[PDB]
From Swiss-Prot, chains A, B, C, D, E, F:
The Walker A ATP-binding motif also binds Pi and PPi. It comes from Lacticaseibacillus casei (Lactobacillus casei). Coiled coil: none annotated. The gene is hprK. Its EC number is 2.7.11.-, 2.7.4.-. This is HPr kinase/phosphorylase. Its cofactor is Mg(2+). The active site is at H6, K27, D45 (proton acceptor). Keywords: ATP-binding, Carbohydrate metabolism, Kinase, Magnesium, Metal-binding, Multifunctional enzyme, Nucleotide-binding, Serine/threonine-protein kinase, Transferase. It is an enzyme of class 2 (transferase).
Length: 161, 161, 161, 161, 161, 161
């Protein structure tokens, strides 16, 4: 079977990232900068997921929404038109989700245990780049590169200075 | 004759765009990122318009303001100095206006019926790119490409799936 | 001797810039976009300064923090890993400081009279580019190019129009 | 009336530039990097000019060639498809022409006295950027900025050192 | 089983592209600009392919060559070091091959019928961008966008002008 | 005392690089792409060096040549005009030299033992990026990152696979 979720599904560095968060927070706008930044859009506002394996989930946009993105202030926008074929992608695996929230103090998952992170929304923060970094990073670990390793490496430096 | 208006007049993709909005909203700052992004500045803070035809209006900066842009925090700035000749332009036609506002719920015009749009200002929104998109888009339509057409095209897809 | 300060120390255009401001304002996030924008990180959150001359001060990161940057939402991040060698620098001279504040109305200095500027934090303002401009500008003056000169030059224009 | 010419007509910085030169030299390929670099394509391989004034000439592509560009190795290419609306433009004024030649030693014009320059083709030369510079420059002069002026300015420096 | 081939295997837009061509032609250098341009390197100079399905082939670098790239003039280079994690990728599917040749006049395939194209090497041609375009294009077709369709569309224009 | 040399002196990543090579090879053109790429020009065609220490040499342009660059096809060019203050720099230390040559088969130094490398000039090679890499690399080593280390690291992989 399949299901539907809110949020926009972009493709960053070939990494399926599903941006989620209470309406108005800035998911469509952020996905627009990401697309403008060379990344691929799959689904905006509403996403149709269809689990492929027991560890791999796929998402896509409902037929009507294809190649489209709404943005409070300009309304519906065809990214294919404005940016060319490299701004859209039919389907993709959701390898990570980013929940855009707001403010408080501070390795989650979701609907079929999928890597998830939550970033706060506040003045002076480019969500587009933070999501770009979030992806680069997630990808970096998969290869073994971790902040912890570098951190353990720095610690030696002192001990053995 | 001629007249003067508040707001900054940038040139995006050869498209005269006049950014307007209550002081402090971020018109000069936004025009600074647009310039840094390769677009041309014509007039900042105050613009002198002089209707050419009955359908074409032109705008320019008062002599003193030439090549200058003020920014709360750094004061007056000469864009010619910091970015070179490609960051400034003497005059230009105002083909579109963008009114930067704030928040509520939701094809206007103005002083000689000129295409106009209003975008809300709120955390997580790169006004510079939204204005860049606004221009690309306005330009796209003039060529026939519309979200509606793509939308009607998607609708068929289902009907004739 | 030496001392320690809060704030992040980036290197922009070979210009040592120390970003300061009440926690949460967005110094680490902003330094992350600057790094992503090709600039070099020296120290994040905490900086260790060691005056070289009576006019030249140097700053560096405590051994553990080396190559690292924390960001509310992704935690500790190794910029060397994500961006390569050109995103980090061991030490550097602090030629300018930028204090990120908020709101009110409106050529300072500090601990060994060092050029300083204060920029307000508010929606619709890319601190990363403003700091980039701040640096370009500071650098421009050192070469004689000033807004004042251009301003005096524009004034003639009228007088001798 | 109208006429037709060989060469590709790109739009750089809103400046109509008609690239010409013996087949195989690299006009289509170069116009492809320029388009990829954010500039607008008007006509490739063959251009249809139609003088507007006695000082202003306009050029456009024959209907079939619209939005297309051939490239030895990939054949016909639709730039609208690959790059979006901002990669094409219907018509434009030819303000400058650049003749791509080869080698020898060293302010021309043409068919209705139009500013013209000739650049040599040889290993280690990015024609795309040289044409970009050629345009920026042509534009810079129109505003008064000239190498000669800067040169006369440098000369004083010594005399009055 | 598996096999080995000459040429470099880059990842462009998530598209496995295997650049081939007589030594000295410029495969490593070109892959270096592509990496510098944000694309991922998998294997340089020598590639180890291992067919996954009967329609899908995979390629990777021999253990020693990992993260490395030789360039006549600088010798061996670690792209991970210079550009960060986003410049390398362990393995990938070879969806297309580009054979860099030279000169003569003018839909091939190879070892398990894989889409292939041949581009000529000659002054005034940025192989990096042509390969970038080659990929965008190959990808564009898979989605239905073709030069032929646009061409048939232009033809109507006249017939029904 | 002081002396003069041929070649152009650019500043890449704050690294003084002196490009040398038989006239016509493409030093000025290459330095033009580097400047366009955000790097700083110090001296073109002719450089005036003045040894500071016994290990540190400085170079600058003769007063007349200041801010200027000649390019076969456009003649003298003022980079300050076309690109802004960030395209020029008064003086700088020459930390590396790159000799642009041509073709044959294959850790030098010079006039006060200065790190030197020689790169071949041939179709399909972006000298601008190779020089950019050359600098990043030289800089990377100074920090300990070497291809050899990564190479020794890869070798273990097999031995201890």
């Amino acid at each position: 079977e399949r299901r539907s979720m809110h949020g926009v599904l972009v493709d960053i560095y070939g990494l399926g990232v599903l941006i989620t968060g209470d309406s108005g927070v800035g998911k469509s706008e952020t996905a627009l900068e990401l697309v403008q930044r060379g990344h691929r859009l799959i689904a905006d506002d509403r996403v149709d997921v269809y689990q492929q394996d027991e560890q791999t989930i796929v998402g896509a946009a409902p037929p009507i929404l294809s190649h489209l993105l709404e943005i409070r202030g300009l309304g519906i926008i065809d990214v294919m038109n404005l940016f060319g074929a490299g701004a859209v992608r039919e389907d993709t695996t959701i390898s990570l989700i980013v929940h855009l929230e707001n403010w408080t103090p501070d390795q989650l998952i979701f609907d079929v245990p999928v890597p998830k992170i939550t970033v706060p929304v506040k003045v002076g923060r480019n969500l587009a780049i933070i999501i770009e970094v979030a992806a680069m990073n997630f990808r970096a670990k998969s290869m073994g590169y971790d902040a912890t390793k570098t951190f353990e490496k720095n610690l030696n430096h002192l001990i053995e200075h």
